[PDB]
């Protein structure tokens, strides 16, 4: 009865202090989490963007109605390549750097 | 004295649980903190492979208005790749060693 309630009160009090004390130690940790969040995102994004396979420049030197477009590449030689579905043969005129 | 013992007991219960949620929140953050810190040091490795030798000189051929830069490499081919937020594009312009 009386004995029962006092033991509960003591035990709530005891653990209230334990959590309050721990909270502090991890508040310092949260501040750092945020710091690290900014950098996790910014670093990863700038590396993958530069790492991308170099998109070489060609100039639509010839064109055909069969899908093939002869692009004089800036490496030296010409290549005959077939264009994607993003770019269309309507967009590809002579003099068009691609 | 049942009245006395209850009043102290109810006082401590609410504070105890209030701190417990904060402790639980900030524990979870602790683990994520360590995971993300390891990732900033790993991402700095990716960054540092970009900074490492071999390196090749390029000179900027032109600036496209879409936020990409066309760089004529000293090998031959000019290539279109994205820009960084490490670098500035006010330092990039036609003839700009990079």
From Swiss-Prot, chains A, B:
It comes from the Archaea. Disulfide bonds: none annotated. ATPase which is responsible for recognizing, binding, unfolding and translocation of substrate proteins into the archaeal 20S proteasome core particle. Is essential for opening the gate of the 20S proteasome via an interaction with its C-terminus, thereby allowing substrate entry and access to the site of proteolysis. Thus, the C-termini of the proteasomal ATPase function like a 'key in a lock' to induce gate opening and therefore regulate proteolysis. Homohexamer. The hexameric complex has a two-ring architecture resembling a top hat that caps the 20S proteasome core at one or both ends. Upon ATP-binding, the C-terminus of PAN interacts with the alpha-rings of the proteasome core by binding to the intersubunit pockets. Consists of three main regions, an N-terminal coiled-coil domain that may assist in substrate recognition, an interdomain involved in PAN hexamerization, and a C-terminal ATPase domain of the AAA type. Belongs to the AAA ATPase family. This is Proteasome-activating nucleotidase. It comes from Archaeoglobus fulgidus (strain ATCC 49558 / DSM 4304 / JCM 9628 / NBRC 100126 / VC-16). The gene is pan.
